[PDB]
Structure formats: C-alpha cells, structure tokens
Design an enzyme around this catalytic site. Structure first.
Site, mmCIF file in Angstrom:
data_model
loop_
_atom_site.group_PDB
_atom_site.id
_atom_site.type_symbol
_atom_site.label_atom_id
_atom_site.label_comp_id
_atom_site.label_asym_id
_atom_site.label_seq_id
_atom_site.Cartn_x
_atom_site.Cartn_y
_atom_site.Cartn_z
ATOM 1 N N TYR B 155 0.825 -1.202 0.000
ATOM 2 C CA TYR B 155 0.000 0.000 0.000
ATOM 3 C C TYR B 155 0.865 1.260 0.000
ATOM 4 C CZ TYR B 155 -3.777 3.303 0.911
ATOM 5 O OH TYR B 155 -4.660 4.359 0.829
ATOM 6 N N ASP B 236 9.445 3.012 0.664
ATOM 7 C CA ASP B 236 8.292 3.760 1.142
ATOM 8 C C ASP B 236 8.318 3.715 2.667
ATOM 9 O OD1 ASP B 236 5.860 4.726 2.037
ATOM 10 O OD2 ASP B 236 4.661 3.764 0.471
ATOM 11 N N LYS B 263 2.817 11.027 7.104
ATOM 12 C CA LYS B 263 2.222 10.842 8.429
ATOM 13 C C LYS B 263 2.641 11.906 9.470
ATOM 14 C CE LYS B 263 -0.109 6.981 7.284
ATOM 15 N NZ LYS B 263 -1.558 6.732 7.498
#
Ligand SMILES: Cc1ncc(COP(=O)(O)O)c(CNOCC(=O)O)c1O
Ligand SMILES: Cc1ncc(COP(=O)(O)O)c(CNOCC(=O)O)c1O
Lengths: 432, 430
Positions: B155, B236, B263
């Site tokens: 993801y 990532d 984030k």
C-alpha cells in the site's frame, strides 16, 4: 532584441542588489531542496524572493519590502493572509483536538455547504489537494464506464501529475490520454464521436488557468457535453480554480451540467484541500457499505481544513462576495484592456471575474497555441517592474484578486501597468 | 456461534451509541456512506469522534477511550500537544498563504535530510500518495524506463494499492507485482525484466497488509538486484520512518535511491515528502532540470511550523527509540499471553507498530492471512470499545507519546479478557 536583453540584465541586477537577505536565504536552502524549491511556480530567475510576513492583502519579503499582493496563493488565498475568522476557527478546532482518527462533527457540515452552493454535486469526498481530486475523479469515471481513454485539452492543467502541452507533460501519469485542441468545437465533436466506445471521460477546465486565463467558449463546452452524452462518456469539469468565478461557480453560470466536478484552493479556507463530487450513482462506487472502490488518505477529513473551510465560506467568501469580487475584476480587466488598446501595444489581459492574465499578443486568445510565439523576457520585465511599484505578482502575469484588496490597491495596479507601457515604449511589440 | 456473538456485539454497540448513529444517517446524505476516508468506516456504523486530548478520545455519545490507533501513525504527538498548537498559532500570526519561498520550509527540509541521511535533497507534497507518485515519476524519467516492481499486499496510497494484481483504483503504470518476502522470485523476475525496470518500490515493513516485516534477506535481494540491473530502489517509509531513531531502512543498514515520507513528519498537519540522491532530485531543479512539480499547499507555513516543532521538541530520534522499546515490550507481552492461552492468535510488527492476527506461525505476507475469519477482528474491535479502548477494525495498534504505562496495561488486560470470554470461538494453537 539586444535592448530587451540589456533591460533584463539591468532588472536582474537591481533585483539582486536590493534583496541580499532573499539571496542569502536562497543559497542556504539550495543545499536541501533542488533549486531551494518545493513548488515549481514559486521559482523565478535570478532567484525567488523569500516572503517573511503577510497581513490582509499585503506581503513583506525578507529584506522588508512591502507589497500589495496581486497573486494571493494562486487563487487559494482569497481571504488574505491574516483573516481572524479563519485563524479563530483553526484555533477552536485545535483546542477540540486534532488527528481525531474517525468521522467527525465538522466534515458533514462542510460537505453539506459545498453541495448546496454547487447543486451539481449530489455527493462528494474530500482529498488533500486538487491533484488528488482529479485523480480520484478520473479513477471513478474509468471504473464506472469500464473504459480507459481520457479526453483532455492542449494547455490543460489538472495538477502535479496531470498537465498537458500539445502532449502529456513529462510528469503526467500514463493514463491513456487523447489530447485535443482547446476551444476547437469541430475537432472535439469529430474525435469524441470517432473514438466513442473507448472514451470514459472528457476532462476540461471551463476556463483554463495555468495556460493564461483562457475562457472556454460556449459552443466548445456545449459540444463537449453533447458529445460525451452521445458516446456514453462522463463529462468532468475541473473547477479547482473556476468555482470562485461566480456565486455558484462558472459551470452553473454557463448553464452546463457535468457528471463530476472537482474543487480545491480556497474551499478549505486556506488549508490543504481538495474535493471531487457529482452524480450520487457515480459516487456510490465509494460507499464503503456497497461500492467496490476504496478511497483513503490520512488527512482527507482533518478538523483544521473542515473548520477553516466552513468559516471561510460562511463568514467571508459567500456566494454574494464571490459575485461582488467578480464584478471588481471585470471592471479592472476592462480598464487594463482599454489602456493597452489606447497605447497601441500588443498587450492584453484575458480572463473572467476576479482572475486575469497579462499577455503580449494582439487579437483573440482562444488557446495556448495563440501564445506560442510570445517573447518570455517581456513577462519578466513586467514582473520586476511591478516589484518596483510595490506590487507582488506572478512571473506568468497571473493576476488574482482577494477580499482585502482596496479600490486604491486596484488603482495602483492600473497606474503600474501605465508606467510600464510609458517606460518601455521602445521595447514592447506594437498592436499593428 | 460466531454469527450470534457478532449480532450481539452489533446490538450492544448500536444501543450504546445512538448519537453516532444519528450523525451517520444525517451525514450519509452528502458523502457516500457518510464517508470521506475508507479506513474510517466499519459496520454497522462508525463512531463520530467529538474531541481529543493527549492519548484520549471522546465519541459523540460521550465515551472516553484510550487511543491505540492515533491517526494511523500520523498522530504520534497525541491530539492536543501544546508545542504543536503554539507553533501553528505562531505561524498564523506571521500570516498564511504566503505565496512564495518562506522562512520555515528550509528548517524542516534540513532537519529531514540530517535525520535521514539517505535523503540528500527533498521536496514536500500534500500527502504520502503524492510523494510516492512523484518518486515514481522521477525514477521513470531518470532511468528512461517504464516497468515498476511492487509487491502484493503493498500500500502506497489512494491510487497505489496492490493485491496479487493492482487494485481497481490504481493508476495504470506498467506494474510488475511480486510476492512479498519471496527473495528467489524477486531475484529471478528482476533479472528477467532487468533492462525494462526503472524502479523497485517496497515498504520495509508492510503496514496496511498487517504490520508484516520485510525479511533482511528479501530486502537485501531487492537492493542487490536493483543495483545489478540499473533500477532505482525506493523505500516507502511513510509509516516506517518512525520505527527507529533514523527510520527502519537505516536500522537495517540498507540504503535506497529514494525515500518517501509522510504521516507524523508534518507535526499532525497534511504532509508528504520525497527525496534521496541529489543527482536524481536534480531533475526537479527549476534552473536546469526537465521536471516540474508544483502543488499549491506543498510548502504551507502551517505544516512547516508544526513539522519542525514536533520533530525537535517531541518526537526526537531518542523519543522514537524509546517508543519503539515500549512497543517491543508490549508486543512480547501480547504474544506470550496468546501462547500461554493456547490460542491461534498473535501480534506482528516492529517497535511502536503492531497488528493483531488470528493465525499461528510465521506471518511473511498477506497470503498467510487470506483465510482468516474477518468476524474475529470485528469481535476484538467491539470488545476493546467495551473496555474503553479505541483501536482500528483491522487490529492495527499504534503507540503515541502521551500513552501511559497504565494505558498499555489496560490494552494487555483487555486482550486477556477477550481470550477468557471468547475461548469457545477462537481457533486453537497446534
Ligand atoms: C506505506 C504507506 N505509504 C503511503 C501511504 C499514503 O499516505 P497518505 O494517506 O498521506 O496519502 C500510507 C497510508 N495511507 O493511509 C490511509 C489513511 O490512513 O487514510 C502508507 O501506509
Ligand atoms: C484547474 C486546476 N486543477 C488542479 C490544480 C492542482 O491543484 P493542487 O495544486 O491543490 O494539487 C490547479 C492549480 N494547482 O497549482 C499549483 C500551485 O499553485 O503550486 C488548477 O489550476
């Protein structure tokens, strides 16, 4: 030609000598970001000014020059730089707590307000940018139709990975794009009909922004609506910039209904923001109860954006305020065009309402093709000239009004254009 | 039996939250399923969250919960950190939407480059999704190639998700999807399609698929094969950067060509970043490079201020390490408990991030979890709400700075009560 080169070199030098703090800052920042830059439109040669402070429609650079702001965060900063209504809403939201990790009390009320102001939006979802909104809109259209081909237009700009010259830009995602000429109704009809069964979506700005505030003609845009309906494609209006142009956006002013609409910029009250919405049956793809499509994103529904957006749209940039600001812009654009025509220069301002763009050509501007021969050094001379006259503008000559700008501010801009013509008579192209 | 237990949970949950239910029905009018962010929805309806303070959250019906999900890793500072709030107020007093290079962006850029030295230069985005899109775009243009290697269960954002095939929402790049933690298939496929492969994109620990660590040999195979073949390796670390004082890749000693971030790095504000090798990032230098990258909120003073404040005053490298240690101790206690009780249940992950799973044995990829009964996750989720614990439906457990040792004890205790009250429903070990 050699005289223009010389005037530019003089502009660069004066700009340099007057801004040593901005230069020092640029050199230092260049170590950690490519060209000291995180956002390409902000860069200009020899180096960009560092902005230190903002208040109302005024900005100050690192060297303490005060400017009247005529670019306003590329249409996002319609509230000016220090609106108490925005700040207090953000403060109250933070006191309630941030990063709330759930459905909240604020998102629903902003969604409602948006659907009410833009009735073509039956349901919407929030994204973190206009680029995301268009990506999600295109994703939805391909799945809803079961087709792959996307019609877009030369000069079209739809975000960081969705830009087009005559071809897709180097950074554009590799969707199957069919790039057609903007404002060419005949070619649009023919190419859409010809490739009918393949076309999932026609994506268009009702007025192109980045390419130079180029209005989409009635016949061209009606042709897109009719052709899409004909072949079974969805029409998507990119109103990221264009929604501020009238009380209920430009599409509604024109009387054309798109299947989906994308939004951004000011709608989040000056906070990071995007949204895509439209027909409930297309949006139903994202209904987590029944739909096959997932759309997450950490900051989609963040309380800062939700709060700042509702505060801004209800207290400051109301439908009525949007109409009134559009009126001021039209008045301004008419004065500037009359001035240019009177002085016999090949110069004009194109656009609608509170948005316009300087161009160094005579005649009708219908697409970016009409600007292909323009000497780019002329835009630069204007930009540096405007700095000298205490005006902070865009390198591309993109003029953007915000709520705090006074009529006196507007007068200063007109005078500055006048002093520009009068100072550069030997250098500017003639109308004929 | 499980059907009945689930129906009872729905009933209990419904009766305890009528204001959330009423809010949901009213909100469903303007957003599909009242929803703007998929992970936030769960049946029969999601709680509306009214307020947050430290590591506590209040729902619309007034319940206070200990927060064990913390904005899906973004909320590492808690919901009301004064350092973040004061920094944001300060920035707003200097003016917002400043429409240019500003005084705050350079501070944060330097900070990131120094704490994550694999990042020589960077650019800010508005999300992890954009950061990943931009990094992929950079890699394709730098190499002159088209094929992108990614991994099942991976993801990377809203339009970059993969099962065995790309998800229906995924941008149609030329993707080659490979099994996670399968070093032999990775080596064979990367060499087979070598000259076509621009980039290998991987999470050093997969987040969304259930906190599944990338095995060292697998991750090294990626570095080795990418280098062999001329592809760029992109880590990532949108989630993973928090797992050690200098991120997970650095803990493992592996260097990627590019790294993506998001984030918590923006202090709780909308944020993403991509960066790495100065020569690859040069493609974006406006003076000389062929690539353009705008985006109106990229460098906004809100994010720049909050990010710098959070990273210097609160979630320092030292703080990242200490939180990871508290996470390791929590996971160990949870796993001992599950083994103690003889249930086919475990918690996978690293440091401050872990995920509940209803399987026995080594979890190496999403394939290992495919056959899990999803109703057990729901049962756990609702049980934790009963015990005043707010987690995620998927069983994702996220530590934040204000969580007390007593909060953590409550979490362990609530898993204990879960096992002891549902012993007849849970699959048995061995
Ligand atoms: C490894 C990784 N990369 C990238 C991303 C994408 O980051 P962003 O959501 O900022 O686009 C995520 C998670 N995105 O979370 C979705 C949500 O919590 O709603 C991620 O886990
Ligand atoms: C019509 C349109 N769609 C989409 C967009 C993209 O929206 P966003 O920049 O929020 O991704 C824009 C403008 N984005 O401007 C870039 C910048 O100011 O740095 C736009 O004009």
């Amino acid at each position: 030609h050699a005289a223009i080169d010389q005037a530019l070199a003089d502009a660069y030098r004066r700009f340099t000598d007057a801004n040593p703090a901005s230069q020092r800052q640029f050199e230092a920042q260049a170590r950690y970001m490519p060209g000291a830059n995180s956002r390409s439109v902000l860069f200009y040669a020899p180096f960009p000014l560092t902005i230190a402070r903002g208040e109302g429609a005024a900005l100050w650079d690192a060297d303490g020059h005060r400017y009247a702001d005529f670019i306003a965060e590329y249409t996002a900063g319609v509230y000016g730089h220090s609106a108490p209504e925005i700040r207090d809403a953000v403060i109250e939201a933070m006191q309630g707590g941030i990063n709330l990790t759930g459905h909240n009390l604020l998102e629903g009320r902003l969604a409602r307000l948006i659907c009410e102001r833009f009735p073509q939006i039956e349901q919407l979802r929030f994204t973190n940018s206009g680029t995301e909104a268009n990506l999600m809109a295109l994703t939805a259209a391909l799945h809803f139709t079961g087709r792959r081909k996307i019609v877009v237009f030369s000069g079209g700009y739809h975000g960081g990975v969705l830009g087009f010259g005559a071809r897709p830009s180097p950074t554009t995602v590799p969707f199957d794009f069919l790039v057609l000429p903007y404002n060419d109704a005949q070619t649009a009809r023919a190419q859409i009909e010809r490739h009918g069964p393949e076309i999932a979506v026609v994506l268009v700005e009702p007025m192109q922004g980045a390419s130079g505030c180029i209005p989409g003609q009635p016949d061209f845009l009606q042709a897109l609506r009719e052709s899409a309906t004909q072949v079974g494609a969805l029409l998507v209006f990119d109103e990221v910039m264009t929604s501020r142009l009238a009380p209920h956006g430009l599409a509604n002013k024109l009387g054309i209904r798109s299947d989906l609409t994308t939004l951004g910029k000011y709608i989040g009250g000056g906070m990071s923001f995007g949204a895509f919405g439209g027909r409930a049956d297309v949006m139903a793809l994202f209904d987590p109860r029944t739909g096959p499509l997932a759309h997450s994103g950490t900051f989609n529904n963040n309380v800062m954006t939700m709060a700042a957006g509702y505060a801004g749209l209800t207290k400051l940039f109301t439908p009525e305020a949007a109409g009134a600001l559009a009126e001021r812009g039209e008045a301004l654009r008419a004065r500037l065009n009359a001035l240019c025509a009177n002085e016999g220069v090949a110069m004009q301002f194109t656009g609608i309402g509170s948005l316009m763009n300087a161009h160094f050509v005579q005649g009708d501007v219908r697409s970016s093709e009409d600007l292909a021969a323009v000497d780019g050094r002329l835009r630069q001379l204007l930009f540096f000239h405007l700095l000298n006259e205490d005006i902070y503008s865009s390198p591309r000559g993109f003029v953007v009004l915000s709520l705090p700008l006074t009529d006196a501010d507007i007068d200063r801009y007109v005078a500055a254009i006048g002093s520009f013509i009068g100072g550069h008579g030997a250098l500017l192209p003639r109308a004929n």
